[model samples]
Target: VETFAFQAEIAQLMSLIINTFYSNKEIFLRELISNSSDALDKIRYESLTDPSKLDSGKELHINLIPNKQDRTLTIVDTGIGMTKADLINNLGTIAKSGTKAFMEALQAGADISMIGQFGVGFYSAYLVAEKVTVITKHNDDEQYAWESSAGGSFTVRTDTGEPMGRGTKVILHLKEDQTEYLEERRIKEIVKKHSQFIGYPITLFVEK
Candidate 1:
């Protein structure tokens, strides 16, 4: 139901989007890959708190699958997956007020959302996917799938399939101009650019 554009301050929102306009186009891949690591961190924290959660050692990891034949790149992890509503509120809309209200709560000594505002990291997927699809199955919820092109309305449907062991898989349909990203070497360079400091062991096959 989202993707109607921001309901307010269009000018300011445009400015913000324009300002970040891909700090470096090469780094968009890196940013998204690094985001995978962050999602795994989230899964780790969830497993720690939930008694029936999957084992982190068995489920926590990052994976990148590049299919040149299909012109698709999939980055997945057995972490936390998003439900259909996640697609709307997260992809199509940016609820600045709810985030600000969390801040206001802290300032007023009131309660707040479990996850604090972390700026605009999740939405960065729109930077790459011509059509992005997420298939996730969480312990607390049924398997749900969300899809979008980062332009208009999104589609969310419940799916039945293999379990992700409580995590997410993001498939980015690579645009024609971004074919270079399909190579392992280029992907490694991007990961090194933004995620070298991350502690996760980044394993990939890069041709020399």
Candidate 2:
């Protein structure tokens, strides 16, 4: 198990986020869906210009899975995944446009269409999750998982489990105080209100 800390500035900013954004905790769902849509948009653009980039045959969609047995709710997408470097640089910083930085790194130019413009919204996950796990796979790197308790640091390591081909799965281990997010009715209401018009289809794993 490896360990690392966010930059001092990021730590402070995240602390501020948790403190200042608690009252508006419902916004976290909107922000997460928006980020997921942004990822899907990137992949769709890549496929139009270079079909070979997504030769893995990944579909485009978002999944909201509430596993009451695990006390977790997962938001996942078949979108442009992130490499290990991208995770460190993107998640470690606050409010930085990672998609913009990533495009620039490729010398392919910047294209911050929407949603991803302000990455600070990602920290909102902490309002509901005591710990967040992001499992992702990129075309350039092996699958990896990043975990953080929304504290001073987060840990990243290679994942030996099944590969996702090309996408990201964000699992939120719901906090005791925010268990309502694990309810299908509550999640569906949130999606209907804030994510009904997103490009990719958003679905919940209905309880059977």
Candidate 3:
């Protein structure tokens, strides 16, 4: 496993989101689903140039699975997953001055709806999850898992579990106070409100 420290700006950005965004925690799901949509778009666009990128034969969709026993909510997408470098570069650092601008807007009482505008949507996971795990498989690279507990650092390691073919799976270990996200009705309502018009199929597994 290779571990990397969060960029100073990212750490500050995370702290600000977790500390200030409690009232709108449900937006975490919206942000995550939006990100999944982007990933799916990447794969779809790439397949147009290189048909082999779609050779995995997996339908492009997103799955939301809430496990009560495990106290986790997982969002899975068959999209363009990340390579190791992508994980480090994308998650470990922010765009130049993005954090500064976000903090400025946030403190200026700008609408919290501006969450994803600064490219820090992923850190919103810390608002409800004690830890977040991302398992991803890129067509040109080996599967890898990235894990962090909203701490100063995160770890990445190659995974040998069931091959997902291509895409990313994000597992959120919900905090004790955030169990509302594990409820099907609550999650459905959030999706209806925020992501009703997303193009890809977003399935929430329900037990009979």
Candidate 4:
């Protein structure tokens, strides 16, 4: 298990996100789902040239699991997962080239419009979550888990449990005041509002 510290820019970005967009926190779900859709898009696009990329036989879909007991909401997608390096570069730091531009835009009050452009939408998780854990498996690398709590540092470790086939899972440990995200009805409403017409199917697991 290795630990990493967030770049100064990223730490600042997290502070901006948590403080700047507190009122529109529901967008956190939308941002996360959009990220999953993009990952799914990557795998599908890659599979066209190299059919082997699809050998995992995992259907391309997204799963939303809300655990009321644990007070966590997880978003899982059968997409092109990330390797350790990918996790480090992607989660530990802002996009290398866009870091400066992203900060400039945010400072200018561009708000969430800069999310996808700079690939920093993942940080929006801190809007409603106290902690976020990501487990991903890439075809070219071993499975790994990345975790952070919008702090100055994060951790990445090898996953020894059953293989997740090929995809990514993001578990958001919701903040106490953000428990509304774990409600099935609330989640359905958010999905319907922001991602009702997305290409892939999104299934939400709820207790009977």
Candidate 3 lDDT by residue in tens digits, 41-146: 9999999989999987559999999998999999999999989888999545545377778789877987556778987677778878989999999997999999
Model 1 sits at a Cα RMSD from the real structure of 7.3
Model 3 alpha-carbon miss at residue 10, Å:
0.5
The better candidate by lDDT, 1 or 3, is 3
* lDDT, candidates in the order shown: 0.59, 0.77, 0.87, 0.85
For every model in order, what is the number of clashing pairs? Answer: 3, 0, 0, 0
2 against 3, candidate with superior lDDT: 3
lDDT of 4 by residue, 18-90 (tens): 6774477888888889999999999999999999998985499999999988999999999999988788875
- Residue 137 local lDDT, model 2: 89
- Candidate 1 residue lDDT tens string, 96-115: 55445444554675322121
lDDT of 2: 0.77
Name the regions of candidate 2 deviating beyond 4 angstroms: 90-117
> Best-fitting candidate, measured by TM-score?
3
TM-score of candidate 4 against the unseen true structure: 0.92
The CA root-mean-square deviation of candidate 4, after full C-alpha superposition on the true structure, stands at 1.8
Write one digit per residue (lDDT tens) for candidate 2, span 1-208: 5778887655664565556433657777888888888888998898998898878655799999998888898989988988888888755544444433433543464322222345655766877788999999878788999999867988999998887888899999988888888888999888888778998888899765
Error of 4 at 109 (Å): 3.1
Q: Could you tell which candidate, 2 or 3, scores higher by TM-score? A: 3
Q: Alpha carbon lDDT of residue 197, candidate 2?
A: 90
